[PDB]
Amino acid sequence: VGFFQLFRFSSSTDIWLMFVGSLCAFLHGIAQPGVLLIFGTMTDVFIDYDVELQELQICGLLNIESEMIKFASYYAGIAVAVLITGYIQICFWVIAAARQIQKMRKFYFRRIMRMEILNTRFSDDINKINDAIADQMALFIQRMTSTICGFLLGFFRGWKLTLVIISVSPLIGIGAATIGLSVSKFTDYELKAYAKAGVVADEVISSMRTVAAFGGEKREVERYEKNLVFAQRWGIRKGIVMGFFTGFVWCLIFLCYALAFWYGSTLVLDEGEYTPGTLVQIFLSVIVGALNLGNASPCLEAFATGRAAATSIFETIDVEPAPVRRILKFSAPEWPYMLVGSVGAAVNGTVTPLYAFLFSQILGTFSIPDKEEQRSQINGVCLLFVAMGCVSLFTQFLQGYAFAKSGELLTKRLRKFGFRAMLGQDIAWFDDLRNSPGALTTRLATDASQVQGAAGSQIGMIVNSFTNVTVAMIIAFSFSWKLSLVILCFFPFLALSGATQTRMLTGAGIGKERRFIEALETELEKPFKTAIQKANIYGFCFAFAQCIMFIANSASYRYGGYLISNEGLHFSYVFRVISAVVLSATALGRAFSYTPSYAKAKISAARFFQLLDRQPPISVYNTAGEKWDNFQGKIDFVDCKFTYPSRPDSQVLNGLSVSISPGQTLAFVGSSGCGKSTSIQLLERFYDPDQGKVMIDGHDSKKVNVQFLRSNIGIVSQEPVLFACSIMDNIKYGDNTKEIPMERVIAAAKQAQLHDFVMSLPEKYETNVGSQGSQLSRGEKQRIAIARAIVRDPKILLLDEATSALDTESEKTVQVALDKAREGRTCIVIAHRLSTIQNADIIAVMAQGVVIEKGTHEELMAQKGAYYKLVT
Ligand SMILES: COc1ccc(Cl)cc1C(=O)NCCc1ccc(S(=O)(=O)NC(=O)NC2CCCCC2)cc1
Ligand SMILES: CC(C)CCC[C@@H](C)[C@H]1CC[C@H]2[C@@H]3CC=C4C[C@@H](O)CC[C@]4(C)[C@H]3CC[C@]12C
Ligand SMILES: CC(C)CCC[C@@H](C)[C@H]1CC[C@H]2[C@@H]3CC=C4C[C@@H](O)CC[C@]4(C)[C@H]3CC[C@]12C
Ligand SMILES: CC(C)CCC[C@@H](C)[C@H]1CC[C@H]2[C@@H]3CC=C4C[C@@H](O)CC[C@]4(C)[C@H]3CC[C@]12C
Ligand SMILES: CC(C)CCC[C@@H](C)[C@H]1CC[C@H]2[C@@H]3CC=C4C[C@@H](O)CC[C@]4(C)[C@H]3CC[C@]12C
Ligand SMILES: CC(C)CCC[C@@H](C)[C@H]1CC[C@H]2[C@@H]3CC=C4C[C@@H](O)CC[C@]4(C)[C@H]3CC[C@]12C
Ligand SMILES: CC(C)CCC[C@@H](C)[C@H]1CC[C@H]2[C@@H]3CC=C4C[C@@H](O)CC[C@]4(C)[C@H]3CC[C@]12C
Ligand SMILES: CC(C)CCC[C@@H](C)[C@H]1CC[C@H]2[C@@H]3CC=C4C[C@@H](O)CC[C@]4(C)[C@H]3CC[C@]12C
Ligand SMILES: CC(C)CCC[C@@H](C)[C@H]1CC[C@H]2[C@@H]3CC=C4C[C@@H](O)CC[C@]4(C)[C@H]3CC[C@]12C
Incomplete structure (x- = not known):
């Protein structure tokens, strides 16, 4: 019906509590385009100082130290503003959401018991409506503000560079939409492909006494392995399509970067109405807007699910993950495909540090006295961007295909081995009611397809992040190690901004109808207290994560200004080091958020291995016994x-x-x-x-x-x-x-x-x-x-x-x-x-x-x- 109907409150307190938080989220969204404007001003100051420095060694009333302390103080002020605002958003939004959701639960419970003569799914549905309203709607508002203001000031400062970047945005939009559609289309196709092997598995396991009695263990395994290929091939096809499309998106992004930097260079050098700081501000602002728009799809997903579950409740009113070292051992025959996949990870891990390097090169070439050499350097960097986009296309496609192939092969081998192990068990093992035909089929179908998460993709992302961090550290420490250490001081906190995100997110007649009206209202104090404590700790963590980048940038840029004023190093080196370290920290922080799949995959692998490593009292696969001559059946x-x-x-x-x-x-x-x-x-x-x-x-x-x-x-x-x-x-x-x-x-x-x-x-x-x-x-x-x-x-x-x-x-x-x-x-x-x-x-x-x-x-x-x- 509408997500505005969820908040049925005319109560002033809740409305004001939501209003203050929404205002603070709006202000936080304002902050990022504003800090980018300040960043463009700094870039202009740096470029002017570098130009005058080159001129003086073949004005002067700038005092780069004073300008850099002023910019650093502005950054610190924006940092504390972001901290306060984000604290307010989360705290107020989650507190108000908890209040309204507990009020709705109380109203539902008081309304159900008074009338004429799926419950825990309900608990989870109220859970999801509170999830749609607590933090999803604050982050959504902040990101919408960020992207809208980014586009607005991109248009304002210069209306042509942002125009061409917007004109090239759709192709990426179409690619992302097609990837999203393929996500579900290939899931359906994989289910249809595996339907036949699953049917074979259910037919065999459902009647296990007959299979064991006639000794047909080998034949059923043969049928299963014959039918598994039709789903393995569809897994391969989904993997290759997804890898190719993500490579296409990356190549398109890098082509957009090259086009924007060539057009901005032509505008700055020839026309002159754009200063290079304005170029950097416009480009970064549009990139930030695109990122915020892309990151909002999750939030809109939540909004949808929540309106949906209140559409569900609207008329009800008025064993051990220990072994992982053997997963490689079990995946030995697929050693090349993983290795090739590793090559995909070790190459596409350098793209972010190389992008930081090339952006710093573009920034540093704007101080070159020669116009023709400036244009030649910009053309060379644009060609490097094009080559890196093509390389990213090929590498992403190859990595996706190789890791999907390795995962599908491992899944097929696991399915065959698990089916063999299940057929080898004694009959008593099938009557435990914990190993049932449905449960056993689920273990065959889902768990084996889940182990590949810990097997192949995990190694790939680990290698990607390791190579990213290594290349970024090499870049940072090869130009100015002192500033490298200064930003490395904040590096752990920047990584923890995303590393600890999941660790904290996942953490009638005889009755008088009047007794229960009082035993339930007082029961909800403790959940409210735990909710408010959790909201406060979430607010502190989120505010620290949001403001740590600003604080690190302020300190690192103040030290870089000190170095520039004292040590003969370019500003381009400062930008290179700071950007590379920050991007590597973000990548590493994204890397440690692997638990939601890795833990489940390790549990799946442990369960399989436990099933496979079982010795039953009666082993059909055992050759122990003594009866051979002239069987006659003298049973006693x-x-x-x-x-x-x-x-x-x-x-x-x-x-x-x-x-x-x-x-x-x-x-x-x-x-x-x-x-x-x-x-x-x-x-x-x-x-x-x-x-x-x-x-x-x-x-x-x-x-x-x-x-x-x-x-x-x-x-x-x-x-x-x-x-x-x-x-x-x-x-x-x-x-x-x-x-x-x-x-x-x-x-x-x-x-x-x-x-x-x-x-x-x-x-x-x-x-x-x-x-x-x-x-x-x-x-x-x-x-x-x-x-x-x-x-x-x-x-x-x-x-x-x-x-x-x-x-x-x-x-x-x-x-x-x-x-x-x-x-x-x-x-x-x-x-x-x-x-x-x-x-x-x-x-x-x-x-x-x-x-x-x-x-x-x-x-x-x-x-x-x-x-x-x-x-x-
Ligand atoms: C700060 O950019 C750069 C400057 C120079 C170079 Cl060679 C590279 C970058 C760079 O990183 N390109 C990656 C794309 C990117 C960057 C920043 C953001 S951001 O989220 O807007 N960054 C902040 O909010 N922090 C500000 C940034 C300005 C200083 C004060 C702290 C979002 C996306
Ligand atoms: C969109 C950004 C840029 C501006 C700020 C928007 C703020 C003011 C908006 C966003 C969500 C809005 C709320 C959404 C739903 C409801 C329920 C309705 O029964 C009363 C108004 C109320 C409580 C709105 C009040 C205003 C609100 C908090
Ligand atoms: C909540 C309290 C404590 C602080 C409020 C923070 C607000 C007022 C701050 C946070 C970020 C700030 C913006 C950051 C950068 C710029 C760019 C500059 O060229 C004009 C001002 C402008 C646009 C600032 C306006 C004020 C601003 C929006
Ligand atoms: C339309 C979508 C697919 C994005 C592609 C747009 C490209 C092809 C457009 C956007 C801006 C355009 C440029 C705008 C101005 C100039 C200056 C001069 O040198 C003549 C051509 C040149 C360089 C244009 C070439 C074509 C151009 C680069
Ligand atoms: C197809 C969409 C996404 C736009 C992508 C177009 C990109 C890849 C194109 C458009 C215009 C191109 C530039 C046009 C002309 C020159 C000058 C030449 O001496 C070196 C290459 C260079 C600098 C090109 C680099 C690649 C470039 C930036
Ligand atoms: C190119 C660099 C960066 C990485 C190379 C890939 C490394 C990290 C990984 C990819 C897949 C891995 C193999 C997967 C499975 C097995 C079988 C078992 O006996 C354990 C070792 C062994 C043989 C692994 C050795 C290390 C390995 C080859
Ligand atoms: C997705 C990709 C393939 C789209 C095509 C764009 C790229 C590959 C093309 C478009 C125009 C091309 C440029 C056109 C002309 C020249 C001048 C020549 O002296 C060096 C190569 C260079 C600079 C080309 C490099 C490749 C180039 C940039
Ligand atoms: C793994 C990441 C996160 C951190 C790694 C930090 C390492 C690489 C740092 C910590 C201290 C650093 C050293 C500190 C001082 C000097 C002296 C001079 O000769 C410059 C290099 C050198 C020798 C540095 C090399 C890099 C160094 C060893
Ligand atoms: C690996 C990370 C956490 C850094 C650990 C060491 C940090 C805390 C310390 C130890 C040695 C310190 C450096 C020692 C000497 C100087 C010279 C002087 O002009 C101040 C800055 C600078 C360059 C210091 C920066 C901070 C520093 C690098």
Whole structure:
């Protein structure tokens, strides 16, 4: 509706509190163009003094010392003005914002409970409306004032140089807008590209028992690594486009600098209506205005989100980040692409010190007596600007492409390795409710893409800042080291102006409806006190950050004037040293603000490594065991005790002492829960026994290879989970290993009572399963599952309550297929339904799991069994 409707207050105190802060923000915004005007005056004074100095060695009533103490005093006064004004802005704005937001929360809470008979998102929505109103609207006003006044005095002092700079501004505007649009477009494209690999991951992890039972760990990994390339390539494309566009923006900026300096030089030398100080003032003022306009996009983003969340509440009224040293170790194969990226960082790190050097050269060449040599030097510096712009284009593009490629390769490798590790875990690891299909998929998709922040981009920005600081120090200490040390004294504070920014930013009936009107109002004193203390400390930090640059400039320029009056050094050297050191300090301060991504990436890397470095009790990838000759399935149960660590409901899981010879059926019929499916897990070694032994053969379960054991058992789950690849991929999947011919599949299909149906389809055998086909009937996917179970020719069958189809017509087909699937082989079938013949085996398991009944269809009459219990 409007961000002016947020402040519903006619209260005088809040309005005046906001008004004073807004006035001080306006004054602070005024300060920077004014200090730039003073800077232009100094530049004019320096140039005039240098000209007279050169003339005197081939007027004089200037006394550069007096002018420089006057300018330094003006700078100190502006510094204290900035300190006071910024303190007022932050303190008053955040205090008033906290007051109004707590009043709104109080009104909301008093209004919700009195009426006829997403909450913490609300807390975060009020959080964001207070965020839109506390400091975003003060900084926005200050930056708007800064840019408007910068453009205004740029026009006022000279209306042509600012005119051409404005005329060249749009191309940069179009480039920035296109970059902003691409930020979201490529995010959407990357999500669409990764959708397929994510779908594969969810399909595999969702049904992990089936994947592990058939030993299809390698096949799913193969599918995942095959599908990951389509998202890796889109990551590469986004990276290269972004790098090229940022290089284009940088090259355009440097071309603008060259054009402005050539045009200003022509105006100053030929026409003469511009003095060089006016040129410097105009250029710096327009640059400051552009920077302030660019920096306001965040603030406008906040304003938007906040109006939005009050549009949300307007009608409710009226484990350890320790390991990082191994991230490089894990990223060893991508050593060249990072190295090349480092070359991109080490080259584009020098652009700021070189820009300071070239600006100082332009300033110092304005005192050259020769007009033609002046023009030649200016032309040379403009050509250097053009060359540096082109170099920045190429280097930014190359750095972006290389680091995006390294990050995407690392993400793909991490995703594949994490998927392999997840597939290698035991079944119990998937029931913790902290490693869930959704959470595991999130870890595969998001965390791996996040580790690249600590891996590649972090190294790049570190190298960029290190090279920036090194080159700036080399420039500063090679011309005047004394002034270099003087400004280096303020260097740590200038860096901390941005380094500590994040560290401080991130830090009805029976009820009488009248008791709670008083227990809530007094509760909000402490949040108000902490808010006002935080606002005061924020104000002090922000005011110090804003005024430290002015103080440093004042002191350094006073000392530079002293040096010029005493030591025979150019003013251009003073400008060079001071500007280079200040810019390097700003860059370094921007560098240490890396925590919001670096800490998250380190947490992500730690979680992965913890997942990868886990040794499970039952390792499918382990080759430990002893059973090899003539498998027959002489399964035996001895006093097996199970606690079921997922849920301690039936920790007394004992009484199972059955043992069947090879070729014997064994039906487990008992209660509806905790007596049906546990032995399935024990036979599959999904969980190892705790206080019992499962004696599969001459050797026990705990000491037989899991791969070999699962290879000999055919599993038919309760619900038939089938992959969406193909019928062949869903029938030959049972023997996922080699030695699978197109034969032995026709026999399995015939034995599964499916060959006629699979023959009826036009796509006879290459039919695709899923939403792209017609197989939704249970009595057909169940038959494909049974076929997949039988093609491996397993000695043991593990029916797990199949034939759960409502239509009896399909039930008869699946049950006759299962009956033809046994053919005198060991099996443990769970059948709540009475379809299975009771002559298969004896009813022995009760609710507790105790095994007592053993007689062949004659002890079930004296003792309550399956049918005898139901008939009473
Ligand atoms: C002070 O510029 C220079 C003078 C000479 C040279 Cl070779 C380079 C620069 C330079 O740095 N070019 C980078 C672009 C730039 C500069 C300043 C600002 S700024 O934010 O307006 N600076 C202040 O507010 N501090 C003032 C500056 C004047 C003295 C008193 C303190 C914003 C952007
Ligand atoms: C824009 C710069 C250059 C000039 C200074 C602007 C100041 C005076 C503006 C900026 C934001 C403004 C406030 C924005 C919204 C409201 C809510 C409305 O219900 C009453 C007026 C009030 C409280 C405004 C008072 C004036 C205000 C503080
Ligand atoms: C809040 C109290 C303590 C201080 C108020 C600070 C105000 C009045 C100061 C801060 C910066 C100052 C400006 C800085 C530089 C210039 C350029 C000069 O050629 C004319 C004056 C002018 C435009 C100043 C006007 C007054 C000014 C806006
Ligand atoms: C319009 C956008 C894309 C920015 C580009 C504008 C350029 C091409 C314009 C802006 C100012 C112009 C200059 C203004 C005045 C002079 C003086 C003399 O030497 C003749 C040409 C020359 C040097 C012009 C050449 C073209 C020029 C440099
Ligand atoms: C395309 C938009 C962004 C404007 C960029 C134009 C820039 C790169 C162009 C416009 C005018 C050009 C100048 C025109 C003429 C000369 C004189 C020659 O002896 C040396 C190069 C020099 C000094 C050129 C340097 C590059 C220059 C400043
Ligand atoms: C050109 C200069 C400035 C920087 C060069 C790049 C440096 C900082 C970085 C970029 C990527 C880094 C490599 C990334 C990963 C590994 C694998 C592991 O065994 C640790 C060392 C090693 C081999 C790193 C060595 C240092 C390295 C090459
Ligand atoms: C984005 C870039 C490529 C835009 C093109 C602008 C640059 C590359 C072009 C425009 C005009 C060119 C200048 C035109 C003429 C001369 C005079 C010659 O004796 C030296 C080279 C020099 C000074 C050229 C250097 C390159 C130049 C500045
Ligand atoms: C890393 C950054 C932030 C700070 C580095 C400060 C270093 C480079 C400074 C601190 C003290 C300095 C020295 C102080 C005095 C002299 C004596 C004379 O011969 C000039 C150079 C020399 C020898 C300086 C060289 C640079 C120096 C060693
Ligand atoms: C590395 C940073 C923090 C600087 C640390 C040293 C600072 C605090 C001190 C130690 C030695 C000092 C210098 C010693 C001698 C002189 C000569 C005299 O004309 C005063 C300025 C000057 C040039 C001093 C400037 C300040 C100085 C550089």
